[PDB]
A paper describes a structure:
PCNA is a ring-shaped homotrimeric complex that encircles DNA to act as a sliding clamp, ensuring processivity of DNA polymerases. It also operates as a platform for recruitment of numerous other proteins involved in DNA replication, DNA damage repair, mismatch repair, and chromatin structure and assembly. PCNA levels on DNA are regulated by loading and unloading. After completion of each Okazaki fragment, the Elg1 RFC-like complex (Elg1-RLC), which comprises the Elg1 subunit associated with the Rfc2–5 subunits, functions to unload PCNA from the lagging strand.
We then constructed strains expressing each PCNA mutant as the only copy of the POL30 gene, expressed from its endogenous locus, and found two PCNA mutants PCNA-D17K and PCNA-D21K that accumulate on DNA even with Elg1 present. Retention-prone mutants PCNA-D17K and PCNA-D21K have point mutations on the DNA-interacting region of inner ring. PCNA-D21K is unloaded from DNA slowly compared to WT PCNA, and is retained on DNA during S phase and even in G2/M phase. Elg1 can physically interact with PCNA-D17K and actually shows enhanced interaction with PCNA-D21K, suggesting that accumulation of those PCNA mutants on DNA is not due to a loss of interaction with the Elg1-RLC unloader. The structures (at 2.80- and 2.85-Å resolution for PCNA-D21K and PCNA-D17K, respectively) reveal that the mutations alter the inner pore of the PCNA ring. In both cases, the PCNA pore becomes more electropositive due to the swap of a negative charge to a positive charge. The D21K mutation positions lysine 21 to interact favorably in a bidentate manner with two backbone phosphates of DNA. For the D21K variant, we observed no significant conformational changes relative to wild-type PCNA (Cα RMSD ∼0.48 Å), indicating that the binding of PCNA partner proteins should not be perturbed. Our structural analysis and modeling indicates that the D21K variant strengthens direct interactions with the DNA backbone, without a substantial perturbation of the PCNA structure. The PCNA-D21K mutant provides an excellent tool for testing how PCNA retention on DNA affects cellular function.
Residue numbers in the entry:
A (entry chain A), B (entry chain A), C (entry chain A): 1 to 258
């Protein structure tokens, strides 16, 4: 058996929106200590990796490990079916015929029960996070989202450049160009808004804006976004959940296509 | 002559939205005691039947009966032309060249007058309400609307099932399934929200979701919705107006297409 | 050099929306005393003419005259890139390679700099305002906008008719007709809302609704709209800026196409 009760369905809804772009079908490995899920896009340049621990649920129980393969368009369709604030419960049995999603509101009446037919997916799981990235920064998710959205209208390629205490986002395109330059600082009235940066090596990488636009919709899960960039590996964009994370690994455009 | 002054145009606007889906042209029989109107969809599985009495107007006068045949797309276009709160007045003469819609706001200046060319429709009027239905229920229009909207994304056929004190809405589809189960109760703090049910015979009927989605947009006219279901007749969905009603008769899917 | 600092980017954004409809590329002549710009639509029936004086800026400096030819779709794309309240600064040099747009918010950090490649446009500048128009009226921009939007759904041609103290807007079309009749008055509690009219000659002109819909989006720049109409010239619709204007000259439909 498996019973995972979210305190508010909105968290699961936004987690799956993190995947609803950018990728199609997903395996959800539920183990005794929580849920992991991974998904690669078709061009195989962006991996989405979710980890929800037990404390991020209001209740959680998994007797044996169980893998739930799900169509994200169909699961999203099912996930529009409550309020954001209803307690959504995932329920499955030993070898799962299908997953069962059980909503419940503050008015304990009229409980709604959906069921998603589970598909079969072959689980090629990737561990591609490095130990050392060339630079690490963190900034408010809102601010990263606006930078990406704005620059995405000038060209289809956004270029992130890190020098000593200087983070430069640039898009040069046919019509024109744009450049947002941010610098590290500590806001004392609100550590909400600070911009942290550790630079071990300057970086100059360029990413497709399609994918950065995909990545920034995790802003609805975390106040802040962590960006680990490296010339030797895909870049990592991390949104921290209440004891968990949603991660986007994105490969930069190559040298000759910059 | 005919002068029918709505206190607020929004009521007429929402009544015609009740028809703007699901059907195209409509006859409006205006008699000394108010307005009736009827309209069948093309597949001839859903009838929309409106009755507005005199008291639902702020003023009403009809010397002789008169039938106003109207294109609902065109009348809707005309009906976007004020505020929701302006006093809309229908005006016609003995044998009507066309209908005249006269708006007026709280600032008695700049009055706006539209005219809709009347068409010719042959009035095949249907009296298909039964005396006894197998079961009758009533529930808040908001709640019925959310049930229908949610379940409509899983399959194109919603199945209503009434057993002793148990009302079950179910959609099973290709991707998955959903089931909302409600039970009768009396809310004392708010009779707004109660769920009434009289069951003389259990029912198990299945309706096309296209049409239930059409039906639920009468939620903007009434706090509550009344559903009379029967295996021997089309189901009746009723929204009560201030001394009147908007009714949807919907034929269930047949036995072999369930 | 040229440095023109708007106190709020929203003004420039709305000015360019005034052009984003109805016309494609535009020359902006910046001289020592401010900015002028002109643009004709393809059918050559509507001219848009902007004049921003120095006081409409929070800061302004232009050493020598300079013409900035801009793609309005591309400049609009760039103009979605801040907040409405950031101080947008236009910057160019003696002979301009391209225009530079520099945003700045209340939080003086992270300043964003865009650049629009300038095109080459041949400046056929028109001075088509008359001395005497047949009639002049002024009314709230909101009210003119609603009249146009409403009447635009009945036909594609709106007909403005001015008699002694009577301003009549009419659209007769295939489906039906509509007519808004306004009359001059002075509101004392709010000169905001008054309707002024000087009639030297009655007018009966008819305008394509495509273009009136284009014209009314200047409502976001001025509380009021001034309409000079004449049978001997294109009609002039004027929105007054804080020491400036946005003007729409629109040729009426001819006599035989009324």
């Amino acid at each position: 058996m498996l019973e995972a009760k979210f305190e508010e369905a909105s968290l699961f809804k936004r987690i799956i929106d993190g995947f609803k772009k950018c990728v199609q079908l997903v395996n959800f490995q539920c183990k005794e200590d929580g849920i992991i899920a991974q998904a690669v896009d078709d061009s195989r340049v962006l991996l989405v990796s979710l980890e929800i621990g037990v404390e991020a649920f209001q209740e959680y129980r998994c007797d044996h490990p169980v893998t739930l393969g799900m169509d994200l368009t169909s699961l999203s369709k099912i996930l529009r079916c409550g309020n954001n604030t209803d307690t959504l419960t995932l329920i499955a049995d030993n070898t799962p015929d299908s997953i069962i999603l059980l909503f419940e509101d503050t008015k304990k009446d009229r409980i709604a029960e959906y069921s998603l037919k589970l598909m079969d997916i072959d689980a090629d799981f990737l561990k591609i996070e490095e130990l050392q990235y060339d630079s690490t920064l963190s900034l408010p998710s809102s601010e990263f989202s606006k930078i990406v959205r704005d620059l995405s209208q000038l060209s289809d390629s956004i270029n992130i450049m890190i020098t000593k205490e200087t983070i430069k986002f640039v898009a040069d395109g046919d019509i024109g160009s744009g450049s947002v330059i941010i610098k590290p600082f500590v806001d004392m009235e609100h550590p909400e808004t600070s911009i942290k940066l550790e630079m071990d090596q300057p970086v100059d990488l360029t990413f497709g804006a399609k994918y950065l636009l995909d990545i920034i919709k995790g802003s609805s899960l975390s106040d802040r976004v962590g960006i680990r960039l490296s010339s030797e590996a895909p870049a990592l964009f991390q949104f921290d959940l209440k004891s968990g994370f949603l991660q986007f690994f994105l490969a930069p455009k190559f040298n000759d296509e910059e």
